[PDB]
Ligand binder design. Structure first.
Ligand code: Y6Y
Ligand code: Y6Y
Ligand code: ADP
Lengths: 755, 126
């Protein structure tokens, strides 16, 4: 019906004054890339930017950065007017003034440090009365455009002088400072923030709708996870982006108050939040205000918990107050808090992933002049076990180390050192290495739920196994309707069996990666720990985690560890039943409605596995992972040696074919030994050359020789001299024996219905 | 949806229905963003909560009482079990006859036994 066609959305690419549009429609907007585009927002304001095309952008909405969005005063999910304007006018002595309370970050000259590096060749169209953010000197300064020779807007070009003021001026209060938290500042969690945004949009973004429709929106959300995961960040960003009035109920803030009037503070906070519609009440450290009852005989603790319960149940559906809470784990707060209507929905922020850690690194490293040597990927990979707060601390430590090495060495320090000198220093990769050496998590214990990054390329061959895994996992999700049509319920359970080191864990990770489903790996040591400690109730917690991360692929690697611990094959006097496997069976039987979670088991000793594991509703689909073939061996060798620099002269196919029955582990060991031999030779040769050369100063030429720059053939012969066959033919005999026993009997091959 | 909602309670079902309604309102309706203090009813009448919404809600249900033991009148009938005529007859005797005709059991001074034990090969439908 002739819509506006312009919507507000988050920006994926790092850029200011740039707006992305959906690639499918260029004639509708009638503008392709690289053209000034005007945009009308609200309250009689407009902005000018440059338009590009993004394949990921949805046609319905137009991705845009937070700076431009603040300029328009629009918010995420809003609808505004767009107007393709090929016309654009240059400017003369474009004027800029310091704005807001941002001050003391610059000394002496204040225009060469920030404006010049950014407006040089940027061609960013500047309009009267807009604020644009400049990043530099480990700082962010927003500059207002108050004066300009042409009106109302002009595209900046490298031919217009800049008028210098250097006098900061307070910005209008109704305007929102861009230093406040937002969606961009909150990374590493991805799709939990989407769930919270969907959860909170209608109650806050469209409040009047719920007054004309009778339905209850979510008024209680429990953000729970390890400390430092950004739960407070999520709450603040949701409050700011939706415009809701954010109120912070600090856990120990009320609890430090004298008994009998701290309840007064809680009630006053609830009343104040109710007074201003819509609002968000964030109870930080909720496990301190309303913790586990009876295991709390204080006396006033019970009163405070009851007051909190009355307040939560006292929400009269008036206003649009959303009560969000922060807790380390759902099991730490009083269960009565988790009832319906109080906190009926929980989001597990959890530790970030490798990509999450990387993104957190970019958010925390953006004003510091990250060095050119660093790329932030190696640090992210090595930062396993850290949380977003840990990454921020690591970045701050790296910045401080850089400031200590350079800069402060001279000791030319004053009340506010000149910015540009700090711009001169870049945080080098050595600083990041030192910070990683001084990181010390801090959340290394927590279980990791990640979308595995291994792909089918990493796993060589296994075409039949790969196809069945695709069938079982991908087909039900991709075509649920067709599974419903034939009245067949897809089985939820696989069991990989085969010789050790054949890549069952990698196969499970690859199948999880293809479906883009989180992967939870329960190794043998964890099951053995639950067995020795006689704590098998943690299996229930594991399954709950799988439920929270659904869709997920719960993989139980080396599931036969407990059977081996009880005696191996002969075992004890008892049967195959054990506590941990029994709990797993109970959970698997009850874990049928979820549909998302997929259970994969791996075992190198299928004979000793409990038969109840294989009953219907359990890991019915047994898959034999045999030793890699010649093509599989070639693929495994190529995958192992991809990172290492291998000379083209070495014929890897010959090595793969010569390895008659080596497992994947054996091939990896051979590759590692070859790399070690190459490294030892390089270190010894370079060192012995340097030792001789250092005797005479400058003696030999300055020629930059690389004695060994790639793994040579001789290194591969050196490696093969120690080649070992991990898997004996007798236990392969046992695997084929179990596969035969599992075979569908005999005599029914020729079965045919009568014609 | 009812069959797939095993483990939920009445409140859970209400929450699922509310979530489906909100998802339907989000897909259509609020996409245009033509919202006021009280949007016109009939447009909301135009939108019907589609089965895709219910599927999504079930995907976002998360019981909430899945642990509790279930006491249900089983919906399987004798048709589902093939043959077993003799076994079916004795089960009818032992269970149904005492309840249907307590007076006749009282007349002969016999107290019906309360306990059966099915034994046989696995998977035969006990
Ligand atoms: C159609 C259907 C899909 C389904 O799945 C949906 C699903 N989502 N994520 C997953 S898994 C996760 C995805 C990320 C990685 C792994 N799944 C799933 C479930 C089971 C097996 N494989 C996948 C379940 C069960 C059914 C149905 C089949 C028959 C009948 S009736 C009338 O008795 O005949 C009723 C219902
Ligand atoms: C007449 C009688 C009925 C009875 O049952 C009643 C009953 N209601 N629900 C059930 S079971 C349930 C129904 C839903 C499914 C299953 N029952 C029941 C009890 C025992 C065996 N089968 C059924 C018990 C015992 C007696 C009596 C028999 C002999 C004597 S005297 C003088 O020593 O000779 C005294 C008392
Ligand atoms: N996922 C994340 N993305 C970006 N910054 C994060 C993230 N997690 C933590 N941080 C940083 O660590 C700080 C502390 O985390 P915070 O959320 O305030 O504590 P809590 O998790 O207990 O609520 C935050 O102020 C933020 O700067």
């Amino acid at each position: 019906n002739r819509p506006n066609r312009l919507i507000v959305d988050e920006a994926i690419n790092e850029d200011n004054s740039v707006v992305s549009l959906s690639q499918p429609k260029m004639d509708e907007l009638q503008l392709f890339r690289g053209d000034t585009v005007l945009l009308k927002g609200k309250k009689r304001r407009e902005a000018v930017c440059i338009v590009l095309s993004d394949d990921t952008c949805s046609d319905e909405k137009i991705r845009m950065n937070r700076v431009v969005r603040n300029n328009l005063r629009v918010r995420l999910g809003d609808v505004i007017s767009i107007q393709p304007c090929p016309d654009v006018k240059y400017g003369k002595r474009i004027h800029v003034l310091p704005i807001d309370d941002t001050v003391e970050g610059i000394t002496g000259n204040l225009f060469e440090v920030y404006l010049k590096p950014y407006f040089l060749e940027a061609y960013r169209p500047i309009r009267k009365g807009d604020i644009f953010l400049v990043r530099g000197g480990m700082r962010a300064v927003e500059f207002k455009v108050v004066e300009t020779d042409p009106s109302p807007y002009c595209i900046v070009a490298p031919d217009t002088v800049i008028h210098c003021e250097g006098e900061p001026i307070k910005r209008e209060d109704e305007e929102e400072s861009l230093n406040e938290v937002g969606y961009d500042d909150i990374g590493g969690c991805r799709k939990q923030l989407a769930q919270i945004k969907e959860m909170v949009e209608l109650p806050l973004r469209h409040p009047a709708l719920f007054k004309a429709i009778g339905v209850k929106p979510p008024r209680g959300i429990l953000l729970y996870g390890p400390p430092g995961t950004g739960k407070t960040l999520i709450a603040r960003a949701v409050a700011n982006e939706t415009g809701a009035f954010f109120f912070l109920i600090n856990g120990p803030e009320i609890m430090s108050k004298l008994a009998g009037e701290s309840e007064s503070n809680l009630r006053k906070a609830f009343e104040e939040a109710e007074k201003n519609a819509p609002a968000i009440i964030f109870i930080d450290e909720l496990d301190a205000i309303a913790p586990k009852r009876e295991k709390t005989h204080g006396e006033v603790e019970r009163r405070i918990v009851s007051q909190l319960l009355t307040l939560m149940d006292g929400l009269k559906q008036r206003a649009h107050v959303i009560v969000m809470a922060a807790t380390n784990r759902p099991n730490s707060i009083d269960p009565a808090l988790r009832r319906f209507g109080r906190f009926d929905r929980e989001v597990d922020i959890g530790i970030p992933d490798a990509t999450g850690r990387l993104e957190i690194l970019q958010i925390h490293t953006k004003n510091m002049k990250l060095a050119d040597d660093v790329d932030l990927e190696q640090v992210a990979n090595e930062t396993h076990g850290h949380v977003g707060a840990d990454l921020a601390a690591l970045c701050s430590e790296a910045a401080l180390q850089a400031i200590r090495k350079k800069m402060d060495l001279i000791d030319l320090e004053d009340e506010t050192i000149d910015a540009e000198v700090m711009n001169s220093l870049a945080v080098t990769m050595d600083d990041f290495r030192w910070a990683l050496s001084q990181s010390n998590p801090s959340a290394l214990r927590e279980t990791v739920v990640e979308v595995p990054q291994v792909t089918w390329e990493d796993i060589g061959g296994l075409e039949d196994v790969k196809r069945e895994l695709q069938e079982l996992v991908q087909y039900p999700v991709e075509h649920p309707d067709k599974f419903l049509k034939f009245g067949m319920t897809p089985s939820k359970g696989v069991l990989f069996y085969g010789p050790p080191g054949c890549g069952k864990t990698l196969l499970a990770k690859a199948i999880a990666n293809e479906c883009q489903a989180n992967f939870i790996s329960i190794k043998g040591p964890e099951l053995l720990t639950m067995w020795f400690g006689e704590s098998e109730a943690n299996v229930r917690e594991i399954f709950d985690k799988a439920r929270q991360a659904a869709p997920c692929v719960l993989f139980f690697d080396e599931l036969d560890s407990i059977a081996k611990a009880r005696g191996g094959n002969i075992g004890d006097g008892g049967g195959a039943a054990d506590r941990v496997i029994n709990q797993i069976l109970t959970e698997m039987d009850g874990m049928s409605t979820k549909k998302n979670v997929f259970i994969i088991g791996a075992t190198n000793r299928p004979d000793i596995i409990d038969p109840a594991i294989l009953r219907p509703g359990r890991l019915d689909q047994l898959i034999y992972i045999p030793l890699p073939d010649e093509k599989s061996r070639v693929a495994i060798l190529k995958a192992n040696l991809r990172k290492s620099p291998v000379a083209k002269d070495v014929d890897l196919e010959f090595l793969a074919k010569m390895t008659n029955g080596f497992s994947g582990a054996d091939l990896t060991e051979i590759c590692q030994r070859a790399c070690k031999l190459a490294i030892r030779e390089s270190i010894e040769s370079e060192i012995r050359r340097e030792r001789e050369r250092q005797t005479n100063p400058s003696a030999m030429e300055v020629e930059e020789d690389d004695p060994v720059p790639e793994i040579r053939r001789d290194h591969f012969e050196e490696a093969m001299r120690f080649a070992r066959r991990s898997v004996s033919d007798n236990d392969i005999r046992k695997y084929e024996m179990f596969a035969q026993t599992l075979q569908q009997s005999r005599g029914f091959g020729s079965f045919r219905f009568p014609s």
